Amino acid sequence: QNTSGWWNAGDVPAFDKRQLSRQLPLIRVDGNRFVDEQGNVQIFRGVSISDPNKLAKDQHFNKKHFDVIRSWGTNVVRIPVHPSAWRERGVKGYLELLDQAITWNNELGMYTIIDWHSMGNLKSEMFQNSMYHTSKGETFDFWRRVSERYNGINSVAFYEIFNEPTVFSGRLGIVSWAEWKAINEEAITIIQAHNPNAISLVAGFNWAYDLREAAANPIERNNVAYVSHPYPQKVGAPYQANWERDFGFMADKYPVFATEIGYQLASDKGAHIPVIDDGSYGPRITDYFAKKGISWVAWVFDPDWSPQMIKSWDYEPTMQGEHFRKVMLKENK
């Protein structure tokens, strides 16, 4: 942290919007669903890239990477900004990556989710791992900078406050839904004061799985949607009834953006709980979300991070890539 940390970074040059030729339709929350300016329901079906910091190191942070994503039918790209990578590149250096990613998405007709990709208990400052480490100050500062910088770019529609809240059964300490609600409310006040049209994606606990505590005491802000990460082994059979109880019912009251789903075989690279399945979860979760009108983002247009959507940098789809591509090609554009 010279002039690269959130608390000491210099003036940051504004984003030059003369790189953009495209203004996608403005999305807003209307009760239960996302709608455009005509009140037509929008459903988003897309992919997470890996952290731009990793893409740039791997030499695949280029237009071709984003053209392939678009060619899969993708109408939304999720950008998981790891606070670790934000510190490694510094504020200025990281915003150059994020500007370029957003430019490529925008020109290809794809909406963006900016995801502050942490994991654990922000209030108590206990994270799954050092790569997720952040603070309330750094988190608020990030949302202050990106909400202002991308204000008026309709394609940058969604602001995902904090990827995966969890206390890991007390290993990461204690936080009530009430305390988490207050932190989300402050983050959304920051976002809306810089960016009147920003939609905010709010998560509950058990790694952004549960929405029952959210439903009982919802975020008192406009333009809010609720996140779940219903990975294959978060619950067992019967799947649809369990999903409905835990998060799906929330789609009746607010839009639900399942910002991570994915799956691979127990034999596939980096296979771990809760991402292991025989392949039946793919159609099951996709069909469930079609019945419910739920937006979703498959985890990870990357050949290294698990579960993989692509087998290598030749961009051949994996089992999960094949399935999500088929659904995005049929049901999106």
Numbering used by the authors: 6 to 338
Extract from the study:
Cellvibrio japonicus is a saprotrophic bacterium which possesses the remarkable ability to grow in isolation using a variety of hemicellulosic polysaccharides as sole carbon sources. It produces a diverse collection of GHs, assembling enzyme systems that can degrade cellulose, xylans, mannans, and xyloglucans, among others. Effective xyloglucan-degrading GH systems (recently reviewed by Attia and Brumer) contain exo-acting glycosidases acting as debranching accessory enzymes and endo-acting enzymes (xyloglucanases) that generate short, branched β-(1,4)-glucan oligomers (xyloglucan oligosaccharides).18−23Exo-acting enzymes are expected to address each of the glycosidic linkages reported in xyloglucan branches, though the reported enzyme diversity falls short of reported branch diversity. The work presented here comprises the design and validation of trisaccharidic xyloglucan (“XyG”)-type cyclophellitol probes and their validation as bona fide, predictive tools for the identification of xyloglucanase activities and their discrimination from cellulase activities within a xyloglucan-elicited C. japonicus degradome.
Not having been previously functionally or structurally characterized in detail, we produced and purified Cel5B and Cel5C recombinantly in E. coli to assess further the correlation between probe reactivity and enzyme specificity. We found that Cel5B and Cel5C were both cellulases, efficiently degrading carboxymethylcellulose and mixed-linkage β-glucan. Cel5B showed only weak activity toward tamarind xyloglucan while Cel5C had weak activity toward carob galactomannan and no detectable xyloglucanase activity. To determine the molecular basis for the reactivity of ABP-XyG-Cy5 with CjCel5B but not CjCel5C, we crystallized both enzymes and solved their structures by molecular replacement in both unliganded and ABP-bound forms. Cel3A/B and Cel5C showed no change in expression under any condition tested, indicating that these are constitutively expressed.
